[PDB]
Write a protein that binds this ligand. Structure first.
Ligand SMILES: c1cncc(-c2nc3ccccc3[nH]2)c1
Length: 273
């Protein structure tokens, strides 16, 4: 069983998402993360291609868990009487982007460009797989420090991607768009672009741009750090008040600020090693 298959290490974190432990798969010593989610705390349920009742998080992880290393892979899952247990891949050494920015401050634009580009490729992979993450933020991005590769984590607030309006949201409010704050309605892709604008500002400024609902609604972007005109333009574009005024993923990646991105290995060599 699960208890014999894995060696439980220390607690990595806990919160709204449940409890995550560091672990090692006993068969090949593979580093893993073991996430426990209480059944009474799971509101969104779904079903696998076969039809088993599992948390939506398990459905979304299976839809995205393949070759591409930009999303944390689900290796296995187990059902207990009062909880679900998820076995996830674990990079080592690792640091989440929130801890990284907290320690190092505002990122050099070359580093933010490499990181932001990788988040964009990871989000495009999710959307291509029919998955909307809904909680893109620094805390949900892991940095594989040796490879300079970023990985999206925590699909616990996610949903299947659709072209119609969403009227439910349980992600992070300070990353949520003005249409959600004002109308409790949003479309998946343009809400994801707004959160990406919040994240890019966070990378280049060292903190998020808005704290209160009133600021999100006003959408006036003030730069507290020295940021290039091209980067400021891209941020202000992702943070357009009208969802239809926001760039598509293609327009973000074709933006002049996004040109000449470093490869992840070059990024680790210059900025992380
Ligand atoms: C919050 C919510 N859901 C999952 C996590 C999570 N997954 C991980 C995978 C590897 C290492 C650390 C990890 N932390 C954190």
């Amino acid at each position: 069983p699960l208890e014999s298959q894995y060696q439980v290490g220390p607690l990595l974190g806990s919160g709204g998402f449940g409890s995550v432990y560091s672990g090692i798969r006993v068969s090949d010593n593979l580093p893993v993360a073991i996430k426990h989610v209480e059944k009474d705390r799971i509101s969104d349920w779904g079903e696998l291609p076969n039809g088993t009742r599992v948390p939506m998080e398990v459905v979304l992880l299976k839809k995205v868990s393949s070759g591409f290393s930009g999303v944390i892979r689900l290796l296995d899952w187990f059902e207990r009487p009062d909880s679900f247990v998820l076995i996830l891949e674990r990079p080592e050494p690792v640091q989440d982007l929130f801890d990284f920015i907290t320690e190092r401050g505002a990122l050099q634009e070359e580093l933010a460009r490499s990181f932001f580009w990788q988040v964009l490729e990871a989000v495009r992979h999710c959307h291509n797989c029919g998955v909307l993450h809904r909680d893109i933020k620094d805390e949900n991005i892991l940095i594989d420090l040796n490879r300079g590769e970023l990985k999206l984590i925590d699909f616990g607030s996610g949903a299947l991607l659709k072209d119609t309006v969403y009227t439910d949201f349980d992600g992070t409010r300070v990353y949520s768009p003005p249409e959600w704050i004002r109308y409790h309605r949003y479309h998946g892709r343009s809400a994801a672009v707004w959160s990406l604008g919040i994240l890019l500002y966070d990378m280049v400024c060292g903190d998020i741009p808005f704290e209160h609902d009133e600021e999100i609604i006003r959408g006036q972007v003030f730069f507290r750090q020295r940021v290039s005109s091209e980067c400021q333009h891209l941020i202000r574009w992702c943070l357009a008040l009208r969802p239809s005024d926001r760039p598509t993923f293609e327009e973000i990646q074709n933006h002049p600020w996004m040109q000449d991105v470093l490869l992840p290995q070059e990024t680790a060599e210059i900025h992380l090693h």
